[PDB]
């Protein structure tokens, strides 16, 4: 049965483009990052402003939660990542090493490691406790648009404008597999699926694809949206109907049926590119965020 996501709250406060929103694993909070150099924390269910976290010298392209909902990591144009204690709002560590904008980041499930991708075309693996880089992977031949650990942290998937998705062995940093397209469009986002066996990849030819990791081939293709210019997050929605969720450059949130690939909803309201969406871990709630003409985050709820 098709979802009926409806706008419940609009979250204002950032002063430039929002870049990324993420729900805490415990379901309590939403974190947002922005080109305004700030991270903001909001109540996950009602969008209530909680706090602002500051320290980066330039704008931020991504933020991510640790598994216990206590830490954040952010990726900044200032060429660093920062690890934050959410409760105090203080910077615990500044991760230095990248030679150009840091674009994407994630903790592993154990949350002892952070992975980052940068416009310097590398992927780095960092130790959370020491704040020091463990491995630098010569991952790609163009900017790295996304990085994500699998469900036991043993694998990292990375994507790049070079047209490749690569899967890396976390422990050794060595490449296990490269996912290949003849037509080779820039890859703007990748993420492992909730069951651990698929990878969802966005390409800048208005397409999302679900890849079978084991077989190294595409299973599902999702189209209808607009995506040629920005690295827009995408998600698996699993709390109710099994959907794929993405932002779009026509200012809409798109929701597809994972199995049938049919568009089941388009959420209207934003007035600029929807750069980021996230799905609540237990409730049927979507967060979306938009670029500079809008600069708000919206919370949508569905009955199913």
């Amino acid at each position: 049965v098709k979802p009926n996501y409806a706008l419940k709250f609009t979250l204002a406060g950032h002063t430039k483009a929002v870049s990324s929103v993420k729900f805490s694993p415990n379901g309590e909070w939403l974190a947002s990052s922005s080109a305004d150099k700030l991270i903001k924390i909001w109540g996950a269910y009602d969008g209530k402003f909680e706090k602002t976290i500051s320290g980066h010298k330039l704008g931020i392209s991504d933020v991510a939660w640790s598994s216990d909902s206590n830490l954040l990591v952010s990726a900044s144009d200032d060429k660093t990542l920062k690890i934050w204690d959410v409760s105090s709002g203080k910077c615990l560590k500044t991760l230095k090493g990248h030679s150009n904008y840091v674009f994407c980041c994630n903790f592993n499930p154990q949350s002892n490691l952070i992975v980052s991708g940068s416009f310097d075309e590398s992927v780095r693996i960092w130790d959370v406790k020491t704040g020091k880089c463990l491995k630098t992977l010569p991952a790609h031949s163009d900017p790295v648009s996304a990085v994500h650990f699998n469900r036991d942290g043993s694998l990292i998937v990375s994507s790049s404008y070079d047209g490749l998705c690569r899967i890396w062995d976390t422990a050794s940093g060595q490449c296990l597999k490269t996912l290949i397209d003849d037509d080779n469009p820039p890859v703007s986002f990748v993420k492992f699926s909730p069951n651990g066996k698929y990878i969802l990849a966005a390409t800048l030819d208005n397409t999302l694809k679900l890849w079978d990791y084991s077989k190294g081939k595409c299973l599902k293709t999702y189209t209808g949206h607009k995506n040629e210019k920005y690295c827009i997050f995408a998600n698996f929605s699993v709390t109710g109907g099994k959907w794929i969720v993405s932002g779009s450059e026509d200012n809409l949130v798109y929701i597809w049926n994972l199995q049938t690939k049919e568009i089941v909803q388009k959420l209207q309201g934003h007035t600029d590119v929807v750069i980021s969406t996230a799905c609540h871990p237990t409730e049927n709630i979507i967060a979306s965020a938009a670029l500079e003409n809008d600069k708000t985050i919206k919370l949508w709820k569905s009955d199913c």
Partner: peptide
């Protein structure tokens, strides 16, 4: 610099 303030909000060049 990225005129919009961060890499992700900057449109990709050809």
């Amino acid at each position: 610099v990225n005129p919009t303030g961060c890499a992700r909000s900057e449109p990709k060049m050809s």
